[PDB]
From a paper:
CA folds into two distinct domains connected by a linker: the N-terminal domain (CANTD), composed of seven α-helices and a single β-hairpin, and the C-terminal domain (CACTD), composed of a 310-helix and four α-helices. The cores comprise ~250 CA hexamers and 12 CA pentamers.
All structures have been solved in the native background, and thus encompass the authentic α9_hex1–α9_hex2 inter-hexamer interfaces. The reason we could not rely on information on α9_hex1–α9_hex2 from previously solved structures of cross-linked CA in complex with CPSF6 (CAXL-CPSF6) or Nup153 (CAXL-Nup153), is that mutations W184A and M185A at the α9 helix severely affected the inter-hexamer region:37,39 specifically, we see significant differences between WTCPSF6 and CAXL-CPSF6 or between WTNup153 and CAXL-Nup153 at the 2-fold regions. Comparison of WTCA to WTCPSF6 or WTNup153 revealed some minor structural differences at the 2-fold and 3-fold regions, and binding of the CPSF6 or Nup153 to native WTCA CA (WTCPSF6 or WTNup153) or the cross-linked CAXL (CAXL-CPSF6 or CAXL-Nup153) was essentially the same. The shared CA binding site targeted by PF74, CPSF6, and Nup153 is near α9΄ of a neighboring CA within the same hexamer. At the same time, α9 forms the inter-hexamer 2-fold interface by interacting with α9 from a neighboring hexamer (α9_hex1–α9_hex2). Comparison of the E45Aa, E45A/R132T, WTCA, WTPF74, WTCPSF6, and WTNup153 revealed that repositioning of the α9 helix in E45Aa may lead to steric interference that could affect access to the PF74/CPSF6/Nup153 pocket.
Numbering used by the authors:
A (entry chain B), E (entry chain B), F (entry chain B), H (entry chain B), K (entry chain B), L (entry chain B): 1410 to 1418
B (entry chain A), C (entry chain A), D (entry chain A), G (entry chain A), I (entry chain A), J (entry chain A): 1 to 4, 10 to 219
Write the structure that this text describes.
């Protein structure tokens, strides 16, 4: 499943 | 939302901000943090408010609905309900439909979020929504990381910009992203910069690479 | 509105926001959630304020008035009035006209909404208004779900966008919508995508269909 | 204004909002609700502030001044003044000029509005102003309801829009408006739609009429 | 006298 | 009667 | 300003609003109410802030400075100072320069305005400023009420608009304004409307005149 | 002296 | 800033307002009051925030830095430091660098401003900044008061506007400004208006002069 | 953020302000103070919110990520963890990942920032971010201070503006900046102004230099 | 030294 | 390492 787009969050 | 705890309505410019974000950026990656930023402490009613106010893009909103339904059914599976009258000093446990706000009143969500200990229904529903938005953003990416190659006249900085843009779009696990950065980034550079990056070494930072091909 | 309980006037940019929504989007489906979002905790006076400030579209506003009158008469039918002097420690029960705010003062609405137990007149009037707006949105839809067919050069994503746009406009029950999705969506696709969707199976998710005809 | 009770100054964007409304919509009907919406809980000083900040339209503002003077003189007639020193635990009764704020200080208006029992000077002055604005809006209407006739190529919805626009402008009593709706609306339709409306019957709702001539 | 423009108010 | 346009609400 | 009592800084959009008003409307009459509306409860420091932020129009700002100086010297004349050390439970009486805020600190103005009994220095300085602005607006009016005459093709409403615009600009006493309305308005109308107004009578209201020459 | 521009104030 | 005492961050539209002022008006005189108006009750951190956010004009910002350094060194000269451990019920005295906020924490500035008795570090730093801005505005004035002469076709009002614009730019002492007004203003007028102003007399007000040459 | 202590969500116009700053000014020096000004009292969650909402510039955002990782690993090196159950009256010490907010909840950050004594995780993460932004701004400067030379027709003020613009971009230590100002500024001026600056002397202020070459 | 631009302040 | 862009801060 996708890991998200929060690079720093 | 509920801020430190008092409950307020979703502000007009938060709504207008979210509508403008959906209109402008469509489903770019940064839309997801902005969403999360426009919905801090939000109840399920506020989240459904933001989702319902989206005009167009009804295919993506339908996919998001399907994802929310799946996560709800999974929640209900992991949390079986127990029959019995609700005690005067307690309150019922939410179902999957109550997390999404479809079958729960506003004061039930407030009572869930402010109780001791707290039941963070807004953040659960929020992470479900963010899952669906992740699937949408990943699906709507037009590019693949394998096709990002540096041009002969292209500066290194723009090439890195494209590369990490597509990389952020694909949303692969951090190990796979590490492999793509370690292999493809140097692999797909133009001959000169590629040679310089090879000479730099395997463990160079991005800063050293950009200042090397500067 | 009344937020957690203190009473405030309807803010200027909420008014301007609602007027701009009516001017821009006319009677698109998303106008109804926006309305609901611009009127959380609102008293009947605030709801009537939002409705009265609409310029033009007086046919739809008249239909909305008729719907509100019907719901009011039904409320008065289900709640017969009882004669007798109001006790010093109580307050009268609202009629249908008091819910709409036509024959009720502001402090009477506040006293109804803040009382223990509460009488949510703002939410009752609000759901009446939303009923009328549902009739208006359904009537003003120019298209029918039966006429949404995928073109030979049209990508699948745009076809699904049109389909669920009209579907949201028609406001049929969830079972009828389920039948329209299960039958018409695959039925009205172009030959190639139609064949692929037939090969996928009857219980495929929208995500699998879109990524299949991608 | 005075909100729940604390007193605040009239906000800048409320002023700018009212000025923009007067500039844009001139004296359309919806200007009156917007006015009422921009002045909730307002003291006479705030109402006079809104009126004084209007540039141009000085004929209408003069008519409004005359109406306010008439209502003030009538108030003073129905409330004769009684001589005597004001007691230390009481406060004087306002005259007609005090309601308009011409001869009353700000803290006198606050003391009138917050007293137990309350003297709502802001709402009295407000309804006087709304009376004058009603006379202005009625006078500035360019059309008459008798001249609204459906064209041969005109859809029914636009005809109803014009009809209820002029109807809202004329501000006749609800019985006279009922007669105009019952007689003129069907009477002044184009031949085909007129025949269909005749076939519908005398007690049809506007929704049934619009969906019939659709 | 005029009845006002408040259709719902 | 119409079911509304609140897809998620 | 100081609102109900807490002290706040002058908000950014109040400043920008006042600057925009001075840029747009120059010295039209309505600029004075807007000024008064943008400075409710304002300390002398806030008033001087609004005046100092005006770019250009330095002739009018200099005249306003002269008027403020005159009113200050008159205040000091009517309030002679008494020597003696200020008691620990009292505070000094302000001079003319302290009202304008030139020689008074912010907390001295706050202590003057919040004391029991109150010394309203902000409203005194405010009415001085409004006096100077009255002189400026009266001087900068390009027209005279004697030159406002109705054209042969001009509707009555526009003529009345011009007439009461100039009338508001001249700022004569209410008796002189009454004479100008009673004599010049009917006197300077075009032949036909003039005859009709003569036939109406001496004590007709403006509404009857406008609906008569309609 | 001028009487002001506050017609209603 | 710190308002009545609670501490808040500098608002976004205050920042944007200051940036827009610097971009639009450059170093016009009115920029200084606006600055002072956008920084009421501001801590040194807020003042340095406003100064640091200025893009371009780095020559003027460097001059301002030099002025701030001079005022800081002078402050440290007039306030010699005394060695010794800080008592548990006291707090240290600020140096010149602490006033500017370069070597002082935020809570140290708050503790300085809210202490009894107060140490107004924000207003000291603020008046230093305003000194530097005075030097910048005076230096960047392109004109001199000696060169402002009335044209043969120029109205008196525009000539006075130019004259007091340059006069405000030069920032000479009030006595020197008095001499420039008393001598140069009448001296540098065109022949006709000059003769009329000579006939008026030496002690005429600006209002009498403008209405005389009107 | 957390202001005086209550916790609020990051406001919409703060987000929009930061996005607009990144879009407009790219990585100019003043972007860093604006950032710091838009994030006062911000939790790590708010900082990560601001960073994540940046679209494009993914090379710089990746470099910033690397810098944040380095500072985190250094923090964990200087603060070794000690095993043991957390006491009921205490709370755990944050790791490097908790400062960045990647592995810490919101209420853990609030509990860290509001505790007595305080652990300022938001300001630590903030200074790490500002370090990375310093590296980015320094790297993205297109010019060098050695190449800023005054043209033969160029006024001195513009030359100083360019010089201190590049100087601010390079971010060298104050001693090196002192040497560049003392040597290069006078060295790289055009012949005439260079001679005048030589005649002024070694210890002249920038004001004296600009007014000398004026 | 300059006297400032605050005409009324 | 860079010293920052805060000239006055
Ligand atoms: Cl590069
Ligand atoms: Cl690309
Ligand atoms: Cl597709
Ligand atoms: Cl379609
Ligand atoms: Cl129709
Ligand atoms: Cl019409
Ligand atoms: Cl007319
Ligand atoms: Cl005219
Ligand atoms: Cl003149
Ligand atoms: Cl000039
Ligand atoms: Cl120069
Ligand atoms: Cl350059």
């Amino acid at each position: 499943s996708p890991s998200g787009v929060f690079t720093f969050g | 939302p509920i801020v430190q705890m008092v409950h307020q309505a979703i502000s007009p410019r938060t709504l207008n901000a979210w509508v403008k974000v959906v209109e402008e950026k469509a489903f770019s990656p940064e839309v997801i943090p902005m969403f999360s930023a426009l919905s801090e402490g939000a109840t399920p009613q506020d989240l459904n408010t933001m989702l319902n106010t989206v005009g167009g893009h009804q295919a993506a909103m339908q996919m998001l609905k399907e994802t929310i339904n799946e996560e709800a059914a999974e929640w209900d599976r992991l949390h079986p309900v127990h029959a019995g009258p609700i005690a005067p000093g307690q309150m019922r446990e939410p179902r999957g439909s109550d997390i999404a706000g479809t079958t729960s009143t506003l004061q039930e969500q407030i009572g869930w979020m402010t109780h001791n200990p707290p039941i963070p229904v807004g953040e659960i529903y929020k992470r479900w929504i963010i899952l669906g938005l992740n699937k949408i953003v990943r699906m709507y990416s037009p590019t693949s990381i394998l096709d990002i190659r540096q041009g002969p006249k292209e500066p290194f900085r723009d090439y890195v910009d494209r590369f990490y843009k597509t990389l952020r779009a694909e949303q692969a696990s951090q190990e796979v992203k590490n492999w793509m950065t370690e292999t493809l980034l140097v692999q797909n550079a133009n001959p000169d910069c590629k040679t310089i990056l090879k000479a730099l070494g395997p463990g160079a930072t991005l800063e050293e690479m950009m200042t090397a091909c500067q």
